[PDB]
């Protein structure tokens, strides 16, 4: 049920198999091991800030 909290899909949710669901991700990402999250599948996937680590933290 994509109805509530997007079926717990980090990005896209689609109903599948009797009240179930299947999460997917946009180009450059891949459906993580847990079937809900999206993880980068390329060095520079769309939409993400990767400069980070400013210059004063733990890292």
């Amino acid at each position: 049920t994509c109805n509530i909290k997007n079926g717990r899909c980090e990005q896209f949710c689609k109903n599948s198999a009797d009240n179930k669901v299947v999460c997917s991700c946009t180009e450059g990402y891949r459906l993580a091991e847990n079937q809900k999250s999206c993880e980068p599948a390329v060095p520079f996937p769309c939409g993400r800030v990767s400069v980070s680590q400013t210059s004063k933290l733990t890292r």
């Binding site: 980090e10 990005q11 896209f12 946009t26 180009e27 450059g28 990402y29 999206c38 060095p43 520079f44 996937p45 769309c46 939409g47 993400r48 800030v49 990767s50 400069v51």
Partner: protein, 235 residues
């Protein structure tokens, strides 16, 4: 952008600036290594256009800048079907040589029609550009950004004599003071979804900038995602 703030370098890596007969005259967003999405009103046959990705401060050198020539321009086929309506204000620019993606040059994500609208309805998005920082005042040297709330269509309609079509949406503040402005056209209106930003609108038009009771008008990208995906395919 009026009432916004300075972006940090690399904060909006999909943002590009367009240069031509006028310098820094519009913005755009990277679709992929060879394609930029912008506003069709920025590229009405006028000049030859150059695109600069990895840009931050227009007057300085950051050594992150990648300049490219635009070899092909595709304004939406229904733009200018009707005179002066700004409906379908969106266009695609093909670059001569591919951009090299890195932390300062990164595409913006583009969801399907359903999800682009779901993300827009999240009700809060970011606009950015090197446009005017004051109505009729100077342009920005450092990229500016601003969060703007989505405005209900009835309120949107009531704010102007001009027609607001289903291919547009309004965003801004009831009290004014913060808005996109001249020179920002073509830049993105983006919605961040758990750390991943998606394109939800294109900065398009307005009446003056940042005035109380007026809002920024944006091209509703969900209505065009199929077209963007069809024209920007890499071979």
């Amino acid at each position: 952008v009026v009432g916004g703030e300075d972006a940090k370098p690399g904060q909006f890596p999909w943002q590009v600036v367009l240069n031509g007969k006028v310098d820094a005259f519009c913005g755009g967003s990277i679709v992929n290594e060879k394609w930029i999405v912008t506003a069709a009103h920025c590229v009405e046959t006028g000049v030859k256009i150059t695109v600069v990705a990895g840009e931050h401060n227009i007057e300085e050198t950051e050594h992150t800048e990648q300049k490219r020539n635009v070899i092909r321009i595709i304004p939406h086929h229904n733009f200018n079907a009707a005179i002066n309506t700004y409906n379908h204000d969106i266009a695609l620019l093909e670059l001569d040589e591919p951009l090299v993606l890195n932390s300062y040059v990164t595409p913006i994500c583009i969801a399907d029609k359903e999800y682009t609208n779901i993300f827009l309805k999240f009700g809060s998005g970011y606009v950015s550009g090197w446009g005017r920082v004051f109505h009729k005042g100077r342009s920005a040297l450092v990229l500016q950004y601003l969060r703007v709330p989505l405005v209900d269509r009835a309120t949107c309609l009531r704010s102007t004599k001009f027609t607001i079509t289903n291919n547009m949406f309004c965003a801004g503040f009831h009290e004014g003071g913060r808005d996109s402005c001249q020179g920002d056209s073509g830049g993105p209106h983006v919605t961040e979804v758990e750390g991943t930003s998606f394109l939800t609108g294109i900065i398009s038009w307005g009446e003056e900038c940042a005035m109380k009771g007026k809002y920024g008008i944006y091209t509703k990208v969900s209505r065009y995602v199929n077209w963007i995906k069809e024209k920007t395919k890499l071979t």
